[PDB]
A paper describes a structure:
Tyrosine kinase signaling is tightly controlled by negative feedback inhibitors including suppressors of cytokine signaling (SOCS). SOCS assemble as SH2 domain substrate recognition modules in ElonginB/C-cullin ubiquitin ligases. The SOCS family members SOCS4–SOCS7 were originally identified by their conserved SOCS box, an adaptor motif comprising three helices that associates substrate binding domains, such as the SOCS SH2 domain, ankryin, and WD40 repeats, with the ubiquitin ligase components ElonginC and ElonginB (Hilton et al., 1998). The SOCS box mediates further assembly with Cul5 and Rbx2 to form a RING-type E3 ubiquitin-ligase (Kamura et al., 1998, 2004).
Human SOCS4 was coexpressed with its binding partners ElonginB and ElonginC in E. coli. The crystal structure of the corresponding SOCS4-ElonginC-ElonginB ternary complex was solved by molecular replacement and was refined to 2.5 Å resolution. Comparison of the SOCS2 (Bullock et al., 2006) and SOCS4 ternary complexes revealed a common tripartite domain structure with an N-terminal extended SH2 subdomain (ESS helix) that stabilizes the central SH2 domain and a C-terminal SOCS box that mediates a conserved four helix bundle interaction with ElonginC. The structure of the SOCS4-ElonginC-ElonginB complex reveals a distinct SOCS structural class. A 14 residue C-terminal extension in SOCS4 prevents these interactions resulting in an alternative domain organization. Interestingly, the SOCS4 ESS helix replaces the SOCS2 C terminus in the domain interface. This is accomplished by rotation of 80° of the SH2 domain with respect to SOCS2 (calculated by using the DynDom server [Hayward and Berendsen, 1998]). Significantly, the SOCS4 hinge has an insertion of R383, which redirects the path of the main chain. The alternative conformation is stabilized by the R383 side chain, which is buried in a hydrophobic pocket between the N-termini of the SH2 domain (βA residues Y287 and W288) and SOCS box (F385 and F387). The function of the SOCS4 C terminus is then redefined to stabilizing a new interface with the N terminus, which packs as an antiparallel β sheet behind the SH2 DE loop. Interestingly, the SOCS4 substrate binding pocket is occupied by residues from the N-terminal tag sequence of a crystallographic neighbor.
Residue numbers in the entry:
A (entry chain A): 267 to 429
B (entry chain C): 17 to 46, 58 to 112
C (entry chain B): 1 to 105
Write the structure that this text describes.
Amino acid sequence: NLYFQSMLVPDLLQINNNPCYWGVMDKYAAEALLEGKPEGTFLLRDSAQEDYLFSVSFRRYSRSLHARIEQWNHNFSFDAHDPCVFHSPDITGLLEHYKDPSACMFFEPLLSTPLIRTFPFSLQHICRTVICNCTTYDGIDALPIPSSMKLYLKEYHYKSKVR
Amino acid sequence: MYVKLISSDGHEFIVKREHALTSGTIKAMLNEVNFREIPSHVLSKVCMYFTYKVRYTNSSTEIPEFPIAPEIALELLMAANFLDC
Amino acid sequence: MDVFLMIRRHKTTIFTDAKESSTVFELKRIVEGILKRPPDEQRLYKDDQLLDDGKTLGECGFTSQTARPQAPATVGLAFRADDTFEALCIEPFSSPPELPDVMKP
Ligand SMILES: [Cl-]
Ligand code: NA
């Protein structure tokens, strides 16, 4: 494709029910949470970069490291354009793959002990996650709400350049 | 200690003031508040959120799901947005 | 162990909490401060079962799994009209509309 189709993250409600996910947070705030912590301690958060929805922040080699999640062909991975690298149709399955420390290679993230979110999200956000789970991206346009709200429901999408 | 939030269909919800202050709209407009555009099946649910929000703020535990049925989700989205919470 | 409740009568709902080990009577005291009717002038109900003043809320079945902040347990309430009590009556909430077709399976 020379164009792209917007598509809701398929996994969005599962992700928001996953306590390792902290929502809008920058890498400095992740680093503060992860400071000093043991190898493999991790979190999922929104990436502050414009072209990526999510990043993981995790601990390894005594450093707080980050990994943006990429997509391509409806799969997610930490390298979307290298098909040797493992990918999943889900964000959840991509985290699940990197759960086992003795089966993580040095150049791969290690996501073995989730840091647990200690506050609840907003009621507005929680409704969004439920609505998005029932509907598709094009479906959002047919809803009986203002377009300011359509804008809001459409936030967690990725750009599909394939068919 | 308590405040009364009245829905469009006349249902009266007595909730603690501290929990109602979870809404920025309500915090800004404060005994009684009338909501002529929010009906009882939605306001009852908002009240439940205020208790969830306050109880799981600085949580001692992993936080559970706030269950929302798809059937009230859109009205609840607009009331949440209108109530600023 | 806090338990979370909705006390309901006619078009009134009280959102409140109490300990699992607190008594039904103590809950009637909570209601007295709000609604201004003494304990002897109230009946509290779990579904249609009139509750025992001296029992704990946990003994009546209100617990962590049953009476959660996000999904509180309903307690019915009826007041005394003269010598006799009024019938337990709880006006239901409004009904949501049909789900939009884009939101159906
Ligand atoms: Cl968020
Ligand atoms: Na982003």
